[PDB]
Design a protein around this ligand. Structure first.
Ligand SMILES: NC1CCN(C2CCN(c3ncc4cc3C(=O)N([C@H]3CC[C@@H](N)CC3)CCCCCN3/C(=N/S4(=O)=O)Sc4c(Cl)ccc(O)c43)CC2)CC1
Ligand SMILES: Nc1nc2c(ncn2[C@@H]2O[C@H](COP(=O)(O)OP(=O)(O)NP(=O)(O)O)[C@@H](O)[C@H]2O)c(=O)[nH]1
Ligand SMILES: [Co+2]
Ligand SMILES: [Co+2]
Ligand SMILES: [Mg+2]
Length: 156
């Protein structure tokens, strides 16, 4: 049974922990969690690390990264450059499985346009998904897309 190490990264308060607990407990609220899931007929064990805003070690061990910003926090969006740069430096590769996640999609105070984030994700060559840990909207899609990015990378 294939095991995938997933790391959730992003600035303080963007909802890294809320996203992880929504995937695990299906509830809106340890730093590591495990969950066996079936994606495209293949069984796998997701091993998920929740981080703070061991850094080089988790960036080396992580197979895929959820780079999370909050749609109401422009600094958290700008700071994605910093998380993507540190990951690429440690992995010594311009190709690392990553998904850009715009969290708090439920909130009315949006300061980052969906279009702005989509264009950035297109510049990075990674998927972009808007999520809400509060309503569970696209939370599975974000983690499962990341597992699909790791599998596609493993066929390279
Ligand atoms: N509020 C903050 C509290 C502190 N958290 C940090 C706590 C220390 N962190 C660790 N970072 C990496 C390692 C172990 C620990 C680290 O010492 N821990 C300890 C686990 C037990 C206690 N809560 C103390 C933290 C975090 C769990 C490590 C789980 C195994 N692991 C890894 N082990 S590790 O490389 O030896 S890497 C890894 C990856 Cl990339 C994916 C999935 C994984 O399960 C994984 C990073 C997160 C971040 C959130
Ligand atoms: N409205 C809304 N609030 C959310 C959402 N996700 C998280 N929050 C809230 O945002 C705050 C920070 O969430 P948290 O999960 O702790 O974020 P974090 O990125 O893990 N924080 P830290 O870096 O300190 O560990 C909490 O008040 C949490 O309830 C969401 O999708 N929508
Ligand atoms: Co509760
Ligand atoms: Co830089
Ligand atoms: Mg947290």
């Amino acid at each position: 049974m294939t095991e995938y190490k997933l790391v959730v990264v992003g600035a303080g308060g963007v909802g890294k922990s809320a996203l992880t607990i929504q995937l695990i407990q299906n509830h809106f609220v340890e730093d590591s969690y495990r969950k066996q899931v079936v994606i495209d007929g293949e069984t796998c064990l997701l091993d998920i690390l929740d981080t703070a805003g061991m850094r080089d070690q988790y960036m080396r061990t992580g197979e895929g990264f959820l780079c999370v910003f909050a749609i109401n926090n422009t600094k958290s969006f700008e700071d994605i450059h910093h998380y993507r740069e540190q990951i690429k430096r440690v992995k010594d590769s311009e190709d690392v499985p990553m998904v850009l996640v715009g969290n708090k999609s439920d909130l009315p105070s949006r300061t980052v346009d969906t279009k702005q984030a989509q264009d950035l994700a297109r510049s990075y060559g990674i998927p972009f998904i808007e999520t809400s840990a509060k309503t569970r909207q696209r939370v599975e899609d974000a983690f499962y897309t990341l597992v699909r990015e790791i599998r596609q990378y493993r066929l390279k």
